[PDB]
Design a protein around this ligand. Structure first.
Ligand code: PBS
Ligand SMILES: *[C@@H]1O[C@H](CO)[C@@H](O[C@@H]2O[C@H](CO)[C@@H](O)[C@H](O)[C@H]2NC(C)=O)[C@H](O)[C@H]1NC(C)=O
Ligand code: R16
Ligand code: NAG
Ligand code: NAG
Lengths: 265, 98
């Protein structure tokens, strides 16, 4: 499980700006914070984790302060931008921890490209980032309090909280949901499509079969989300006319027991 | 600047007359500013819920739009996307399969 806090910031000019955050544990959204809300919203019964109402109060406040301080500091640091203080500015932060039976991260993108990371005890630019960024990151690395606060959040606060999240939403992260499959085809060669939807967790096995012969050339689509946090996936096979008869789609998933789905074309 | 990819599909096997949920997943775009509308017979559907804007490992934005619908043999459904990287809006029709 990877825990990620995802912040998206849009700076249109010197005086219009919005920032929004969404937080994920594995592939389940746990929180949301819109620009127009003073407070973070939980999107899960267990989003507060094993934290006290005061443990949540304090931490929320740290973030409320931070959100204001980030808005104003970027506005300042943007003046130092190369050729001219260029507009629409888009900033993105990905922060959190990769929880193993943990390693933390804090990455920053500017204009859609990864330019900055916090690493160890300080901010550093990434190789091939715009050189105009070096000074802004010097100014920032002079703030010893923030650096200490960021070290505490990454090294200590994040892992502890996430651990509380995992205990609290065990029954949700452990939920098992069954795929339902159906077949179709598209237009003398044709493409056979096996659609597989409504399954959870994400890991799945779909394949066109000719008896016990796995059909290499079965092409898997991408995982597409459904609204209720189940997945959708389809797998296809190119077939000549009269190559259709004898073919089946086989789906294995954790939730089926040892009872695969086999649908015959 | 990244151009939006659009994929359109149902929660459930689409059977004519049977209430379903239609999805429209727009990915691979930048900047985050986008307009999505789901259509029925070329006309905007009013009860379209949307996910929060999120972004991916590769820094590109994605969102999920979805709406209750019932497949029919007389109705066409579509997804229409306006983004600054495109000249005119881009529509993709649901192919009664997905
Ligand atoms: C436009 C140039 C591009 C720059 C790209 C790099 C920017 C990285 C963005 C992260 C910067 C955080 C900005 C806030 C920080 O500068 C500072 O103003 C505040 C306020 O600082 C002041 O108060 C604190 C107490 O909160 C300290 O006492 C600090 O010493 C003091 O300066 N610090 C905090 O809110 C705490 C740290 C939370 C950051 C975690 C990010 C996920
Ligand atoms: C947070 O973790 C980082 C990651 O290891 C720690 O930074 C290291 O600290 C030691 C001792 O100061 C240095 O010799 C290493 O060089 C540091 N790593 C890097 C790459 O900078 C950091 O000290 C931890 N901080 C807290 C508050 O526990
Ligand atoms: C980069 C952060 C954007 C704002 C998101 C606020 C989410 C609050 C819940 C996270 C609690 C864990 C703290 C460690 C985060 C690095
Ligand atoms: C700042 O930009 C926003 C962009 O949405 C716009 O609404 C506003 O008119 C602009 N104002 C200035 C300072 O020109
Ligand atoms: C976002 O929030 C800030 C702080 O509450 C506020 O001043 C501003 O009006 C908001 N930005 C926009 C464009 O709505």
């Amino acid at each position: 499980y990877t825990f990620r806090c995802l912040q998206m910031s849009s700076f249109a000019n010197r005086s219009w700006s919005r920032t929004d955050s969404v937080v994920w544990l594995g592939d389940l959204q746990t929180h949301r914070w819109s620009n127009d809300s003073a407070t973070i919203s939980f999107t899960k019964p267990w989003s507060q984790g094993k934290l006290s109402n005061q443990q949540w109060e304090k931490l929320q406040h740290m973030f409320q302060v931070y959100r204001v301080s980030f808005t104003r500091d970027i506005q300042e640091l943007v003046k130092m931008m190369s050729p001219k203080e260029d507009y629409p500015i888009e900033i993105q932060l990905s922060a959190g921890c990769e929880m193993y039976p943990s390693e933390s991260f804090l990455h920053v993108a500017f204009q859609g490209k990864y330019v900055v990371r916090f690493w160890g005890t300080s901010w550093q630019t990434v190789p091939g980032a715009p050189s105009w960024l070096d000074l802004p990151i010097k100014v920032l690395n002079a703030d010893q309090g923030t650096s200490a606060t960021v070290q505490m959040l990454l090294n200590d606060t994040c892992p502890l909280f996430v651990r509380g999240l995992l205990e609290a939403g065990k029954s949700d992260l452990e939920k098992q949901e069954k795929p339902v499959a159906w077949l179709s085809s598209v237009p003398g060669h044709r493409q056979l499509v096996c659609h597989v939807s409504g399954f959870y967790p994400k890991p799945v096995w779909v394949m066109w079969m000719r008896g016990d012969q796995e059909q290499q050339g079965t092409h898997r689509g991408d995982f597409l989300p459904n609204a209720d946090e189940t997945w959708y996936l389809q797998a296809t096979l190119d077939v000549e006319a009269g190559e259709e008869a004898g073919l089946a789609c086989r789906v294995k998933h954790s939730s089926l027991g040892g009872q695969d789905i086999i649908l015959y074309w | 600047q990244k151009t939006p990819q659009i994929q359109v599909y149902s929660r459930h096997p689409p059977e004519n007359g049977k209430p379903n949920i239609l999805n429209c997943y727009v990915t691979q775009f930048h900047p985050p500013h986008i307009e999505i509308q789901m259509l029925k017979n070329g006309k905007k559907i009013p009860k379209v819920e949307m996910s929060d804007m999120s972004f991916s490992k590769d820094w590109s934005f994605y969102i999920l739009a979805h709406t209750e619908f019932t497949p029919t043999e007389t109705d066409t459904y579509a997804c229409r996307v306006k983004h600054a990287s495109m000249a005119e809006p881009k529509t993709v029709y649901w192919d009664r399969d997905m």
